[model samples]
Target chain A: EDSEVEIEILDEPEQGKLSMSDEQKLHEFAIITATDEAFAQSILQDVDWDLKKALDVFYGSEAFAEARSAAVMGVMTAEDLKGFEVSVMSWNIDGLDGRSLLTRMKAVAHIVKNVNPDILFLQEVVDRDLAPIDKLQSLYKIYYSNKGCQYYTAILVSKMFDVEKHDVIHFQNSGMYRTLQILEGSIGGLKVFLLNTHLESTREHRPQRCAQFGFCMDKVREIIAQNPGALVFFGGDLNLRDEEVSRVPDGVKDAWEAAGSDNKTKFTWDTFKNDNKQGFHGAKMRFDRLYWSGPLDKVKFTLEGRQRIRSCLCFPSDHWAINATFFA
Target chain B: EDSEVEIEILDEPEQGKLSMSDEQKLHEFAIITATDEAFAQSILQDVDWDLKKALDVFYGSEAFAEARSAAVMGVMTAEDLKGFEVSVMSWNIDGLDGRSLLTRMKAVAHIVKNVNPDILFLQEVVDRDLAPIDKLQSLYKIYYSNKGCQYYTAILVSKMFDVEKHDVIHFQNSGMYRTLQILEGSIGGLKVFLLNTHLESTREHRPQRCAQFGFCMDKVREIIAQNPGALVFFGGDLNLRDEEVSRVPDGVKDAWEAAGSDNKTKFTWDTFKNDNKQGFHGAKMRFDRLYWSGPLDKVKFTLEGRQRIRSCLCFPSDHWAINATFFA
Candidate 1:
C-alpha cells in the first residue's frame, strides 16, 4: 500500500522566543536531561518556567548524585611509552593547473601514500582542489597556512603526533604575501616543533625572496629559543641557491649537507628531464631545501624523485621531495 | 608563553559496569534529557535509580500537559505547487581505474555539473572511488544499488525530488549478481519513478544479458501497473543492440530511437578513437541505452557524448551518456 510521509524542512527559531509545541518541548527536554519527557515536564512545572532555578534546585538534590554515579563509566589506563621515529617530506605541486590536473594529482597522491611520511609539507595548494590530498586524511591530520591568497602552503602530520598548538606568521616585506605555518606537538613524550614555508619565486624576485628567507629564519630561531630541547625541523620550497644556503644562521644545519650527499645528487629542482610544458627543459637548481636545529646524530635524510612514483611515467611535481627521518 | 594541555586517548569501555566520576555522570545525564545537570539529578533522586519509573510518572502528570501547551509553537504553511521539468543522464564511468583515475573522475564531475541533470544514473561505480561523485551532495541526493559486488550502479536525484521509497531487486540466477535500483519520489507534487541498472556485459554473454533485461522489464511493468500515470524513466549501460532493442515491451520506447539518431551517432560504445588501454580500441556498438514508458507528450530525449565534454581531450567514459527531459 502507498503511504504519504510529510517531511518538514524548516530553519531554526530565533532566540529570546520560547515558542514550541508540547511534543517538541518534550523531545528537547528529554534530549537535554538524558531523561524521559515525563520527568522533564514535572521539573518545568515545579519551577514555574524558571528553567535556570529548576536546574539549580535539582542539581543540589541527592538524586542527581546517585544518578550520576549509576551513569559513571570506567577510565582507561595510559599505555606504555615507546620511542618515536618520523619521516617528513616537502613538495610544491604547481597549483594543480592545466587539463592534466587530475592525472597529476593522482600521481602526487600515489607518491605521498607510497612514501608514507610522518609529516608532509605542500605548497601552491588550493582549497577547492584539495580532494587528492584531503583523501589522505586516513593517514594525516591536515593544517593550512592562514594567508588568504589564491594559493597557500599546507601541513599534514601523522596521527602518531599529538598536535597541541598551531599558528601562522605572515612576512610583512614580501609582495607575494608569504607566511610560515608552525605546529607544536608531542611524539613519544618528547616535545617537537615543525615549520613549513614557501618563499617568493622566480629569479627576477631575488630581493623579495631574500627578505622572506631572512624573516622565516628569524621565526625559526624565535621558536627554538622559546622551547629549549624541543626537536625542531623547518622545511619547504625555499627556492634558494648556494649564496642563500650559506646565509642560513648558526645552530640550524642544512639536512642535505648533514646527510653527506655528494655534489652531483644535491640538486632538488631539476627541469632537465621534465616535459616542455613544465618550462624547465634543461635547468637544475637546488631551489627546494630542508633545515633542522635539533640533535643531528639522531636524524637521517634522503631525496625522492620520479623514480619513487612507479605507477606514473611522469614526475608528480617539477621539484624532488626532501625526506628526513628523526629517531628518539 | 608555552602552555601544557594533557590529552587523554582511550578505548571505549565494555558494557554492564559503571565506574565513571560525578562530573562525567552529570554530563551524560544532561546530554540525554536536554536539561541541566541540576534538573537531571533531581529526577534521578526522586526515582531512586529507577530511571524508567521516574519517566513514566512525570510524563503522566498534569504538569507535563501545561508545560507542553506553553511550549507549543507555530508550523509554517506548505509552499505553492509548481509544474516540473527534470533533466536525466546515464553513463558508465569504467570503475575509475588506471593511472589517470583522478583526472578521468574530474572530467566526469565536470561533465555532470555542466549538464546540470536533475537525475543521474551511473554504472560501474565503486564506493572507494566515489569522492568526485560524493562531493556533489550539495546538489543531489545519491542512492546506490544494494548489490554486493565489486562494481555497482548508482542513482543521483536533485534535492528538488522528495524520495519516498527505494529498493534493490537482485537477479538471483545471474553470475555477476546484477540488480535493479528503484526509487519512488515526487517533484513539485507529481509522482515519479526512477530506475538505474547495469546489465550483463560483453557480446559473448548475450543469453545472460537477455535474461537480465527480461527480468528488469518485468519489474518495471509491475511498478507502472501499481502506480498508474506516474512518470517513469529507466536508464543505464544495458550493453544491448538492435536485436535486443526490438524486444523491449510495447509501452517502453528506447531513448536513442525516440530521439531520431542516425546509424553513425547511434553507437554509444566507441573504442575507435579512445586510447589503447581502454580495451575497446576498434569496436563500435550501441551498448549504452535509456528507455521511458510514461507521458510521451511531455518529454524530450537527446544523446550526449565526447562533444558534451569539450574541456577534456579524452572522453569521460567509454560509453556515451543518454539525456532525457520530462515536463509536467
Candidate 2:
C-alpha cells in the first residue's frame, strides 16, 4: 500500500504576535461539503466524514488540526463567546427542485445559520428552489446570482469583513459555468478578494469543458488585471490538477500547494479509489484548490486541514472542502 | 435469468397394470442416487421426494412406460415376504471417505433392505472405495467401478433379482475403467444384462477423456461379441449426451432419449452450478448416463426418474442413477 500522506502542523502561533488584551478572535471555523447519505452508505465506505465530530472538535477536542480548522468568528474562545458559540456548515443539496430538496436545503441553511459560519462560500447551492434572496438579506448581506439552473453559486459573508464592492462574474467556457462572486473586503486594513467558483467535472462535455476552462482563465486574468495591488484568493472545486493551475493564470499561486504540494500533508478531495480496479485514490484527490495572488509571503498563522467524518455503513461523499488561513 | 429447467413427473403406473396382486412375489422398489447436496436439494424442492408418497406410489403406481426404463421400481404389497416395504434413495455425497463414507454406505444399504428395491443403480458412488463392500454385503450384491479420481460407479442389487451369473465390463475406452456387472436374470421371458457404469467427466483430463467415448464403443463391441440371444439391459452414468449416444453401436440406445432429450424430464447429473461464478458442472459436462442393449421390441416398460435422497447430506455425489425395466 502507498504510504499515507503525512501532516505537518504549522508552528504554534508565536506568543503575543497579534496583541489581543481582551481580544479573543483567534478561532476560525471552516465548512467542508457533504456527500448525501445514500452515496455515503453505498460507495464511501473507507473515508472519514462525520457531522457530529465537527462539533466534537469545535466544542471538545483541542487537537491542533481541529482547532486550526474549526475556528470561526475570528477565533472567539468558548468561554468568551459563551452560549453564542455559533457553529455552521454548508452542503451541496445535489440539485434543488423537489420539495424534499428545498426542505433539506432549508434545514441545512438553518443548521448553518444556527451554528453560524462567519463566511460561507456556497456552491452547487440553490436559491430559486429554497427561498427568495430577499429572505436571506434579513439575516446577512448575501451576494448571489441565480443563472436559472437547478443550483446556483453564492457567498454570505457575515457583516465582519469591511466590504467595499462585490461583483458576480459568470464564467461560461467548460461544460459547466458558474457565477463566481468576487468580494473586495479589508481585513485589518489589507485588501482581499474572495474569488469563489465550482468548476466542471472531468466527465462532462469535453469540448464545452475546454471552453469553460479558458473562460475561467479569462476571468482570472480580468480579476488580476483589476486588483493588481489587492490579494486575490481563489477557492472552490477548480476540478483542475495543481500542474494544470497554470492554465488559469501565472499571477495566482495555490495556497495549499504553495504551503507545499510535496509537503505530504494535502488532500482536497476524498474519493480514494484504493479498491477501484482503475487505481484511483478513493480517500484523497486534490481537486478542490485554494490559490492566492499578491504578497502572500507576509501571510502568518496559515494552516490547512480537513474535517473527516466517520460512517457506519459506508464512507462519506466523494469530496470535502478545504480551508486555509492567510492575512490579506 | 435463464428459465429454470422444467421437470415433468414421469406418468405414474396404470391402474391394475402394476397391481399388488399380480406382482405378489416381485416386491420391487426403486432407488434414486443423488450426487451432491445442492443437486439433492434442487431435486427435493422440485419433486417433494417424500418417502411416504414414494412408498404409496410403489404400492399403487403402475408402469406406463416400457418395462426397461420406467419410474424406478414400484413395490407391490408383499406382507407374505419378510421385510417387504422398504425402498432406498441415495444421492450426492461430496467425497467423504473413511468412516464417514462407510457409515453412509451402510445407511443406504439399510434403507434399501428395508424398502426392498430388487435392483438399484447408485450414482456418484465411490466404486473404487472397496471399504464399503463388506458393510453393504448384508443386503446387496454390490457391483461398482471407479470412473475417476473423485467419482465412482456402483450397483446394489437385492437378492430378490435371481442372479444367474455376474461379470464386469468397461463402458468406454477412456483407459479409465468403470465396471458394469451384468446380473443374468429373466424378467418377462427376456434375459437381462443389468449393466452399470459411470462415464467420463467433461472438464478434467480433457485429452484423456477420449477414452470414455472409446470405452462406450468397446462395451458395445463386447456385447455384440457375446451374441447373447437373451435380452440385455444396461444402466449407469453413460457420460455421453442423448444426441451423441446414437453414434454408438446400433443395438444400444438411451432410454431417456428414446422418450425425449428435451422432454423437460432429463438430466441425470444435477450439478449445483447456480449462483457460483467459479464453480461449474465439471466443465458444463453431464457425466451421468443410462442406456440399454436389449431388443427394442421386448422393452415392455422404460421409465426413467431420479430423486434426491435425504440422508446423504442432501446430495449423493454428482449424478442421479437412471433406471429402466423389462417386464417378464
Candidate 3:
C-alpha cells in the first residue's frame, strides 16, 4: 500500500507542466483532432484544460480545415461520408388546395423526383391527388397516415431505406384531425426514425399545437436514448410560432439552425414571394421545419419547390419544402 | 390553416390558472406520484411548476412512503425486483499480507461462499493463495489478471452470470504494476459490466490513483452510454480520498450513498477496528467503494469480512469488502 507516482509535483503552474488529468485530456484531444502533442497541448491549455471547450474551438478552426485533407473525428469524418450521407425532405404539398389540382400534384411529384431525397415527409396528402404521388412507387415505398381522412400525411423512402414498420399516433386534443405519422426503418444499415405530422394549425390553436409538439419531441428524445448509434429525424409542417416551442432536449438540433441558418432557407412560407396563396396579413413564417439527433457532425439545410410550375404558373405548394443533408 | 384551440386564455396569471406548459407538468406529476389532481396541482404550485423539483419533493416526502405501497416510478417499481436483483462484492483481499496466509485465504473463500454474490471483484490476489480461491471455482467462473505477477486482480461470477469476455488495462504510469480488470457479461438477459482494480496506493501515490480512477470512470460512462440497457459497476480498492474524486457523470451513483449511506459499512479501512494492518497512526478511510449506472432504482450497501478468522484469530484482511445489491 505504499507505491508512489514518479512524476514530480509542482508548487506553481508551469508552461509545459500539466497535472495527470490535463495529460489525459490532452491525449484524448490529440486523438480526436489527430493533432500532434504541441498542437493539442496549446489548444487544451488555451481552453484551461477543458476538453469540450477545446474540441469546440478545434472542430472548425483554420488548423482543422487544413487537417481535413486527412481528417479526423470520432469513428468517421465529413470527407469519408459520401454514399453513407442521408438526405431528408419535409414538405406540406397542400393537397387540400383543390384549384389546379392535377397540375399541382404533377408538379409536386416532379419536384420530389428532381430533388432525389432519400426520404420524404409530405403533409396534406389527399386521396384524389394520391395518384401523382403513387407514380413514384417505382423507386419509393410509401406509407400513409389514413386513407379515410380528408387530408393526411405520407412518408416515402427510397429503395436504399429498408422498410421495418410504420404507425400513427392520433392526438386526442387535436380538433383539426391532426395525427403523427411515424416511419421506422434504416438507411445503409444505420437505424433511422421519422416523425411527420401537420400539427393543429394557426396561432390560435397554440394549446393543442404546443401539446402535440411536446409529445413528438419527447418521443424523439426517447428513441434517441433507447437506440444508441441510431439517427432520428422529426420534421413536417409544425405551423409553430416563435414562443410556442419548448426547450428541445439535449443531443437534438434544429436542422436549419444547426446548418448556420442560411438566409435563403430562413422563411419557408412567405406570401410576398409565392403567389400561390392570397392572404390579407401578408405573412412569412418558417412553417416547415426539421430536427435531428445522432452522431452526424455536418449539416446542410436548403429549401425546395421555390420555383413556379410552368404549367400551373404557381408554386408547387404554398409551403416550401425544407431539405437537409447530414454527414457522419 | 385556421383551426383554433378550445381552452380559454386569460390576460394575466390567476391564482389557479396555469399556462399550457404548467398544465402539462401537472399532468406528468399526477402520473408520477400517483396522486389526485388536487394533490399533484398543490405540489406543482409549490415548486412553481418545475417537474424536476416537484419530483425531488415527491420522492423524498413522507407522502411518497405511503404511495410506495402502490408505487409508480416509470416502467417498474422497487416491489417488483424480488427475483431479478443483483449483488456484487468488491474486495482488496491483501493476499500479500502473507502472515497466516493459508487460514486467511480459507476464511476469504468461506466468507465469499457465505455471501453468495452473483459476481465478485477481487484485488491483491497472489499465486500462493490461488488454491483456496480456486476452490470457489466450483461455484464461480474465475478469470485471473496475471498469475506471474506478485499480486493481481480476479473476477469471479456465479453460474447465472454468463461470461462473454475479459480484458486488462495496464496503467502506463503505474510504478507498483497496477492494472484494471474488466469483465463483460450478462445476468438474466440484462447486460452488465464490471471494472476491478487495485489503484496505486498511499497518500503519496494520489496522482496515479486519481488518474486511474478517472480513466475507469470514463470507461464506465462510455459503456453505459454505448449500451443503453446495460448496467455497469466500477469498483475495487480505489484508494481515493474525499477531494481526489472528480464529479461523477450523470446517471451514475455511488452505491454506498445511493443506498442511504449505512454507517455500519461506512469505512472499509479502519485501523482501529481491524488490527491486521499495524499502521503508525490511527486511520479510517473508505478505500473500497462501488459505483453503478443504468436503470437500477433500488440499492443496498453493506460490508463483508468484518469477522476474525476462527483458525488464525485475526481479521481476513485489513480492508473490509464492500457489497452492493442493485434492483432494476
lDDT (Cα, tens digit) per residue for candidate 2, span B23-111: 22222222222122333343333335553343333222222112211211112112322232222233333344443465555554544
* Weakest 10 consecutive residues of candidate 2 chain A by summed lDDT: A21-30
| Winner by lDDT | 3
> Candidates 1 and 2: which is better by lDDT?
1
- Model 2: what is its DockQ? 0.00
DockQ, every prediction: 0.01, 0.00, 0.10
Error of 1 at A68 (Å): 58
Q: Write the per-residue lDDT of candidate 2 for residues A33-149, one digit (tens) a residue.
A: 111243223222222344333323323222322222222101222343232211112333344334344444444455455445555566676545557333565666677656566
Please report how far candidate 2 places residue B65 from its true position, in Å.
91
TM-score of each prediction? 0.36, 0.30, 0.71
Tell how far residue A129 is off in model 2, in angstroms. 7.2
Q: List model 3 lDDT by residue over A1-328, tens digit each.
A: 3222222234544444433487788777775444566778877777678886666555433334333223311133344554467889999989999888889989889988999999899999998857889999997998999879998999999988887889898876677788888888887667889899998887666655655676677677668766776788898999986646666778888999999967777888887788887755466788788998876867989898998888768888888998998885
Mark the regions of model 2 whose C-alpha exceeds 4 Å error after superposition: A1-118, A127-140, A162-166, A172-177, A185-189, A204-207, A247-251, A262-265, A273-284, A298-317, B1-328
Model 1 stretches with alpha carbons more than 4 Å out? A1-84, A276-281, A296-298, A308-313, B1-328
On DockQ, the leading prediction is 3
What is the clash count of model 1?
26
Sorting all predicted structures by DockQ, with the top scorer first, yields: 3, 1, 2
Compute the lDDT of residue B273 as modeled in candidate 1. Answer: 50
Residues B24-91, candidate 1, lDDT per residue (tens digit)? 65565555333467755665677564554434333333333332222111011123222446678998
Q: List the residue pairs that clash in candidate 3.
A: none
Ranking by TM-score: 3, 1, 2
Local accuracy of candidate 3 as per-residue lDDT tens digits, B81-180: 4456789999888898889988898888999999999889999999985799999989999999877999899999988888888998877767888888
